[PDB]
Amino acid sequence: CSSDSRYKRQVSGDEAYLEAAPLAELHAPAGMILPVTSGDYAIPVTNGSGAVGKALDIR
Amino acid sequence: ERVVYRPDINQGNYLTANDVSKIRVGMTQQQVAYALGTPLMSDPFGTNTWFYVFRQQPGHEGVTQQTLTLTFNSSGVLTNIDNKPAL
Amino acid sequence: FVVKDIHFEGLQRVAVGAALLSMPVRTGDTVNDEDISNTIRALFATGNFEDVRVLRDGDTLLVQVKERPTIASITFSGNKSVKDDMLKQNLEASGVRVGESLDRTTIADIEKGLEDFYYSVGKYSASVKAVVTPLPRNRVDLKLVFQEGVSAEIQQINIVGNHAFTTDELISHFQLRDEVPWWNVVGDRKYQKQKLAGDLETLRSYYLDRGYARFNIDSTQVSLTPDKKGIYVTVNITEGDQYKLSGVEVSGNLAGHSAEIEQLTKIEPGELYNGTKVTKMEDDIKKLLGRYGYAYPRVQSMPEINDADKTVKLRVNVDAGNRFYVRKIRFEGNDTSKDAVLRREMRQMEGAWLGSDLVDQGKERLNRLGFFETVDTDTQRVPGSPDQVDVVYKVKERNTGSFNFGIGYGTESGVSFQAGVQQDNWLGTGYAVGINGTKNDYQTYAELSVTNPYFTVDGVSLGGRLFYNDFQADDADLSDYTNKSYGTDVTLGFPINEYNSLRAGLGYVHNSLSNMQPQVAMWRYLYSMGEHPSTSDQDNSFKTDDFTFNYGWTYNKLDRGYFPTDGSRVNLTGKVTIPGSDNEYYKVTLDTATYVPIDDDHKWVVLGRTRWGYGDGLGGKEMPFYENFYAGGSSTVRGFQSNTIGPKAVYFPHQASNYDPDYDYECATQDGAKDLCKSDDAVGGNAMAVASLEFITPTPFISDKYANSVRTSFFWDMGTVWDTNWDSSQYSGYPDYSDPSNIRMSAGIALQWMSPLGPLVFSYAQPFKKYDGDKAEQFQFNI
Amino acid sequence: LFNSEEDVVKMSPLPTVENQFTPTTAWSTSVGSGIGNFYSNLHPALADNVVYAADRAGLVKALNADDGKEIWSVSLAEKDGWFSKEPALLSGGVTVSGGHVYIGSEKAQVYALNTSDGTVAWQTKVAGEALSRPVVSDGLVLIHTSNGQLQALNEADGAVKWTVNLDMPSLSLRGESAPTTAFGAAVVGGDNGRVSAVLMEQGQMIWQQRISQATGSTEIDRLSDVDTTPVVVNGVVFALAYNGNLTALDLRSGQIMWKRELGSVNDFIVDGNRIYLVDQNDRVMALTIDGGVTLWTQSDLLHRLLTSPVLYNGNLVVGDSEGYLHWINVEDGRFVAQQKVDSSGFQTEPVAADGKLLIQAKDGTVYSITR
Amino acid sequence: EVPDNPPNEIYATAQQKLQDGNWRQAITQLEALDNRYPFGPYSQQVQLDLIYAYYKNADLPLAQAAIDRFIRLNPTHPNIDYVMYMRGLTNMALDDSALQGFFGVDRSDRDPQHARAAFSDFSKLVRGYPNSQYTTDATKRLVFLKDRLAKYEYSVAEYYTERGAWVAVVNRVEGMLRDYPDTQATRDALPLMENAYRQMQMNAQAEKVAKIIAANSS
Q1: Given Cys at both, which of C237, C581, D145, E198 links C161, Cβ 3.0 to 4.6 Å?
Q2: Coil, helix or strand at residue C20
Q3: Closest chain A residue to the Cα of B42, Cα to Cα
Q4: Structural domain for C211, as ranges
Q5: Which CATH number fits the domain that encloses residue C196?
Q6: Record's Gene Ontology CC terms (chain B)?
Q7: What is the CB neighbour count within 10 angstroms for residue D262?
Q8: Chains B and E in direct contact, meaning 3 or more beta-carbon pairs closer than 8 angstroms
Q9: Which residue, of C374, C397, C420, is where some domain finishes?
Q10: Rg (Cα) of chain A, in Å, rounded?
Q11: C119, C147, C175: which is the final residue of a domain?
Q12: Is E64 helix (H, G, I), strand (E, B) or coil?
């Protein structure tokens, strides 16, 4: 049929974004704090959790 | 630095001596912004200090720089026109 | 009545409820037969229903419908040259497509709009017959029978009211073409009124640049010549007698640079008026104030035409922006190679006033990159302040990876193969990886060429080379003169100007020679080496550890790094020995690449690729024979085989070859061919003069979607390579090659197809001049 | 070999070459290479035993109308412009009115060549080339030019008496609106497919009625070159619209007696009560003058390059730019003859004058024809 | 593709090739189903299986075409939480992909475009749909994607430190700051802002950053 690295092929999927890269907020002193959240940077940690990542099925 | 030519490095954004004399301690930011618009650098978390800092280095003959700040107060009324030379 | 139930027959694209809402009576509404006939027509107002027979069972409605919708196919027949989709676009304009609502009414309406599309083509002599062919369960095939007669073509243009310049004079300036004799072709003559509109503006310039500023084209009357091909134009103009640029009075917000702006408006008061220069001279202010920070310098001129002396008076009104527009910049299409790699290819810095051309200079470095497909940007003014412009450099990148081939034979010969593989912008780093080598039963070879182009940011291309030629000639090895060669070179770059860049490194080689051949020039360099190795034998071994300083410099004002169409690049490269070397010589060569647009649209472009060189000793010990110059085969001159342009070595009266085998490897060995024979492959000279001249040529059979990556290019390739020390006093009874006229020649075309492994080029070329004999393969397969 | 090169689709050929009453030439001659395949409204005028004919690059030859022996010759080849000795390039036809030969030229010029020698007894530049033949009448050289300008030039010395914009869209809807005179009115059609009457004396519109279509949004062909020039039987305007659509109107008010908004006609004459015509399909029919009742037809010419229908030698005669001539039945449409005297053909009109049938050919020029 | 067949016969043949993984021939069914029968009762679920087939065939814009189709076919549906995830997830897959990862080269400083197009729709999922099995995973992606664009923009911020336009350093750093409140790439842009001030001899403004550094030494 096919061949790739002595397998057939390799398809797309991720758990790396599920690994959710570490974020360390500012402890910045008063009068030395920027408006440090702008844009669509708005992540409500919401949970209908279900399967997640590659285990998350998609229909 | 035993080289003579360098590909010339600049950094503009500077209120010239006209732009210094155009404005005065007491002006609003707007009073400067009608002529001189925004700065490309202000205070991020303090007062309204409008920074306009020139830099340039031509030819291993040193670097030049003209560091201009415009400290408007919390109300934006100008309180300091500090233009600093190189170094 | 009042309907208790509607019977919903035959809908098949619309729903029952979607029918029911298109029915003015819904199930339960009071019902008139007026409303029933309204239910007839408003379901015809679906556009989907062939017939609508609304009736009722007393009051219980029933709607008998066979239906128009989803078209299963639209068959294009007669759509030879005009694209299906072009013809489909008028159909796609007509609200009907495959899977849409048919209407058997709008058949000629689509067709007329297609002849109205034919009207726009450059013809009307073409027709279309759409044929409805009903298909299963509602469906319909739309067979479009195209009755395409003919186009139109430019036949004549009468310009009345013109008395200054001749009409056909102007037609020669006009892209409306009409001259191809049967023995004189300059192209073709075919028609568009859009050329006409531009050639009206070619005319509109054509009086204006003189001084005619009350020049005005009154009207233009093109023929309905009764042939459906004939174009006879009756242009009405007013010649509009000339005016003089009698003065400039530039004004407005001149932004304190008006003296410089006055240098852009240094005119002659009373010169014969050129509005196009005036059009240009407005923009001269705009780039200037652009370079002065003001990205938006509104400059409006007004040549106040004074007819009382036949002059104009150029009012200009200027209004600049503010300086510090360059706030920051953005980049897009940086999705494989590093953003900061593309950010360092710019020249306008953020946190600054604008120098307008540094963007374009920065975009030219990206245009001179060659990992790109196009280089563009977005120079939006971010709203909010007159120091607020970000520049969003959206660009497009190109594919990489390449191959070069070489083989004698597989699975029946020995382990013999030539390799080579290329990976540049190596994993999105900008690094170039090009590595080759070969292992055969003649020799073994290893080589590397990998650069860190920005190991240091100041142009510092950390490019190192190593090679290991275990060159053996494994057929009679000791008699076939084994010489293993290996050595190093690391080379570096720096932008000495911002379009000029230097190259420099140290070259080392470790040649290890053994039983040199009885060639005359072979011992002759060894004679200049101070050696006196024996002509009549193959007996002598030799090592050299030559330490040279190689160098270079790159000029770069040519368009693309991968597919240019305009400009030139100068790349001088050479080497000179240092003390510590086993020989004191030099070796310099010259590399040329210029692109001159034959077509101003650059469809044809002169491709001037010539090669030059000279290397000699530094006194005493000569330049080695392996540093000679050549051509032939895949080279400047192709249609040949390799090493056909140069000196051709004579052998010596010689027996002991170490036994070159039994009438094999004749070098005037003892096995036949003795006593001073001469080879015909070019062993090459210490001077190079070769030149290849090529032409970008568009094909009409590959679409320029994917013909634009293909450069078909014809050539008449020729050149001369001679050795200044190949003396006629030493080479008289065998041919001499110290003349700087040794013109071999072969002419033909190359075949550049751009594959996913990059451009792969073959060639066919025909030699008709061979200076002192050339091995010629007319079919040439380079990449 | 050539079996697989390219493709087009086009017209139908000529059927029925007939020789029932076998035709001939009255004489044969030439005036150079004349009106040509280049579309131009030049054509000779036969008068006074003088073949007033010109080739459209040069010589205006008076030939004798017996043998085509030259009576005089001058050349209207332009000695002036951006260049000396440029060709003639004439747009309007030969108008011999009094002692001048008036010809509208593609140099946007109208001349008056003195009929005794051809000396241009006056010359006048006009507003564009003469798209129609200049109707030289009442001292008014009345032209429908390529811009549609009703111009009146003094036919005595050259003096524009008015220049009034005629009816044609922006691009030249090439086709005649030749200002033919009726009842002291300038009776003009229009290349938009309208029809009008204007004042003959000053160029003041008596009326103008739209008849039918034109190019643009009811788009008609590039072959559409239709004489909107009327043949007004005294009070009844018999004209075509620019798409060939025939009609009958009032002369002084433009009130429609009848209208063929079905007309597709190249060339049209009113022959008694029988409008004889050359269709755009080149089918020769006979419509009425109190309607469009087909009195007879002939499809024995189909998609030809026909000239105007004329009656000569006892037959309706039509020729073509295919070079055929044909002697149509005056009744139902049968060729009683066919005369192949050219094959380059005729853009000029069959002049049944001097008892001849005068045609300058396109390139193999002037013949005269009889039977 | 698939000829005129019963829609359920096409759908059952799809449901083989969806369970087969044969998206090549499932989309051959599922499209030619909705090419002839987009009025199917499962023509919502066809698009739900199409995006399922497309993205698993890695047909991300054709997924996005079917997504926008399912946006336009079913703007009211339970699986728009799937779609608003899939709007992010296709843009998550649209952003960056290469063979270099087996050898150790990364792209989080290459494509910001579909990164933010993922961040828009993933956050539109976790705002608009807290109910889904997608709203927790995408939240983790969004936590990852904030630092991903930070690693992009810090790589930009590292560049202008090398350029010598020290306004252009600190403008990226407040761009690092005001967009990313918490990323380490911002926390390491926090030295670059003060040092660029020390280049412009704005040491006084640089020491205000040093207290932030002293605060975010924690």
Answers
A1: C237
A2: helix
A3: A34
A4: 153-238
A5: 3.10.20.310
A6: Bam protein complex
A7: 10
A8: yes
A9: C397
A10: 20
A11: C147
A12: helix
